[PDB]
Write a protein that binds this ligand. Structure first.
Ligand SMILES: OC[C@H]1CNC[C@@H](O)[C@@H]1O[C@@H]1O[C@H](CO)[C@@H](O[C@@H]2O[C@H](CO)[C@@H](O[C@@H]3O[C@H](CO)[C@@H](O)[C@H](O)[C@H]3O)[C@H](O)[C@H]2O)[C@H](O)[C@H]1O
Ligand SMILES: OC[C@H]1CNC[C@@H](O)[C@@H]1O[C@@H]1O[C@H](CO)[C@@H](O)[C@H](O)[C@H]1O
Ligand SMILES: [Ca+2]
Ligand SMILES: [Zn+2]
Length: 530
């Protein structure tokens, strides 16, 4: 914990909420000054609990770089029309930096450029059958490509395009690595993952392979193109087949006016996968023998079936699908945004389907539960000193994604008539927290803020002789369970929000992931929209 001002290190929007935090004993006056020193704003800090005081400077609407002074402390804050444009662009460019089997040239990727990796065909587990499944994204700090979390990352990017296309239109991905005519930014980027996902479906059965990885994780020092271990397609799984089905039905709808062929191919692939679900058992995935990579296991598969049924309900607009969706919507499943508990994606597809195709009674019950869920998140946010919908127990592996999915839920609800008054405050507080307004004064994104992430658990950043890591990567965040040797050694006894370390070996607090950047893209695009 530093003895300084805690603020949004990326910046503040002209029209947005503006807040800073300080550990204090009582109210203190504060001032905002031009870089010359002239005061433009003055106020008093106010208590918010657990040693924290806040200062609100929302009314300062003139853009510039300001010196914020409180007691003997000083901080440089930025107010701008589109303060989050650069970070949003970097967060979307992260997906292109994760591209597998693709040359990333220096003119696009700069020092983190590299040649095509993992170009070999993968062997289907326990057979001699080889299969080509190039492309898509390296999942995280490792080089595996896993179906289940890939579906969430795709769904998030598609949702961001559907909700905030104007905000996304102001950002540029690695345009020259993608096929012309160029699609809008979120669709341009997500098409790479959608194309790889299509190669993961078994043509014979419609089932989808759980993942393609090497048998084990290579050293942290491994460059993408030096990872030459043989690739293995882990068996087909119910969770991979269902999440694929839902992500494909969603892409079929979104790509309809942009890529008719992709849309038609996705729609067909979604139907063949749903046919596989009807004929197979809800069997949880477990790593086969000799496969030591990310399992992405899950004992609860009803939420994945809910998402697949609701996604096809919306894709087709066919009331016949509500027969399967509605009993699933009645279950006491958590309504979350993944990677393991995906029911809220299904709830959203159901609520976004024309009203005529569904039971009005079920629809109203669904909308009421969503409102009650948001009220509970709002109460958590009300009692938190940083105003984020989190409790100490929520600071688990990928706590930044836990937070961002919750900000996402408020924003998603606005498109389906559930207008919670706290939605925009939560979105702003989640961005503030991610960018430095937290007990560690840590900006949880590489290459941004005054205290960026400098040592992520990310193979290309470790391997290169740059580190200085790849920019725009959202790290997992504080995890109180101390799920790595570094976290256990350095973070024992520390509060839940301080359970983070910027060290390359801390995979449990300092790794990156495509499905951690994906809700960040959605949340940041929402704020930019205004
Ligand atoms: O780290 C990112 C990727 C890197 N690529 C490989 C891939 O396998 C890895 O994925 C991560 O792999 C991790 C290791 O299994 C998963 O970590 C688990 O993440 C879960 C939440 O998603 C944690 O579960 C929570 O833990 C608490 C008590 O143990 C409970 O209060 C919570 O109920 C529970 O959900 C588990 O402890 C935890 O081990 C992550 O979510 C998942 O993001
Ligand atoms: O840091 C490299 C490995 C160290 N010891 C065993 C492995 O589990 C480590 O690899 C990391 O494991 C985590 C899987 O649990 C994973 O989330 C990271 O992607 C791996 O690099
Ligand atoms: Ca599940
Ligand atoms: Zn690769």
């Amino acid at each position: 914990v530093p003895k300084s001002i805690f603020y949004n290190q990326v910046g503040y929007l002209i029209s947005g909420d503006k807040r800073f935090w300080i550990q204090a004993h009582e109210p203190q006056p504060f001032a905002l000054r031009t870089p010359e020193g002239q005061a433009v704003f003055a106020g008093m800090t106010k208590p918010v609990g657990g040693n924290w005081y806040v200062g609100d400077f929302t009314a300062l609407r003139v853009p510039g770089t300001y010196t914020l002074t409180v007691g003997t402390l000083e901080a440089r804050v930025v107010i701008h029309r589109r303060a989050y444009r650069d970070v949003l662009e970097a967060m979307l460019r992260f997906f292109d930096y994760q591209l597998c089997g693709v040359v990333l040239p220096e003119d696009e990727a700069g020092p983190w450029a590299h040649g095509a990796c993992h170009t070999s065909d993968a062997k289907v587990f326990g057979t001699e059958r080889a299969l080509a499944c190039p492309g898509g994204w390296h999942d995280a700090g490792d080089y595996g490509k896993y179906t289940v979390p890939a579906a969430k990352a795709v769904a998030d990017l598609l949702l961001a395009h559907e909700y905030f296309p104007a905000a996304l239109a102001h950002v540029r991905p690695m345009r020259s690595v993608h096929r012309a005519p160029h699609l809008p930014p979120a669709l341009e980027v997500a098409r790479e993952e959608i194309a790889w996902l299509l190669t993961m479906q078994d043509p014979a059965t419609g089932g989808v392979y759980h993942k393609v990885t090497t048998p084990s994780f290579p050293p942290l020092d491994t460059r993408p193109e030096d990872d030459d271990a043989p690739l293995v397609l882990s068996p087909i799984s119910y969770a991979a087949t269902a999440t694929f089905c839902a992500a494909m039905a969603h892409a079929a709808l979104v790509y309809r006016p942009f890529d008719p062929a992709l849309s038609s191919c996705c729609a067909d692939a979604a139907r063949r996968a749903y046919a596989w679900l009807g004929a197979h058992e809800m069997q949880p995935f477990h790593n086969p023998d000799g496969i030591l990579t990310g399992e992405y296991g899950d004992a609860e598969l009803r939420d994945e079936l809910l998402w697949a049924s609701c996604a096809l309900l919306r894709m087709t607009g066919d009331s016949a699908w509500a027969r399967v969706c509605e009993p699933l919507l009645d279950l006491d499943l958590p309504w979350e945004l993944g990677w393991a508990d995906v029911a809220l994606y299904g709830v959203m597809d159901y609520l976004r389907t024309p009203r005529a195709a569904v039971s009005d009674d079920v629809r109203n019950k669904v909308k009421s539960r969503l409102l009650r869920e948001l009220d509970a998140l709002a109460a958590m946010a009300e009692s938190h000193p940083f105003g984020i919908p989190m409790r100490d127990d929520d600071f688990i592996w990928g706590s930044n994604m836990v937070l961002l999915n919750r900000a996402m839920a408020f924003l998603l609800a606005e498109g389906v008539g559930v207008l919670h008054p706290a939605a925009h405050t939560v979105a702003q507080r989640a961005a503030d927290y991610l960018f430095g307004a937290n007990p560690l004064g840590q900006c949880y994104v590489t290459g941004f803020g005054q205290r960026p992430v400098r040592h992520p658990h990310h193979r290309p950043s470790v391997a290169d002789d740059v580190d200085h890591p790849v920019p725009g990567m959202v790290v997992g965040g504080p995890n109180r369970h101390l799920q790595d040797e570094i976290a256990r050694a350095q973070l024992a006894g520390r509060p839940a929000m301080e359970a983070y370390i910027d060290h390359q070996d801390s995979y449990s607090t300092n790794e990156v992931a495509v499905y951690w950047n994906s809700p960040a893209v959605f949340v940041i695009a929402a704020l930019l929209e205004a």
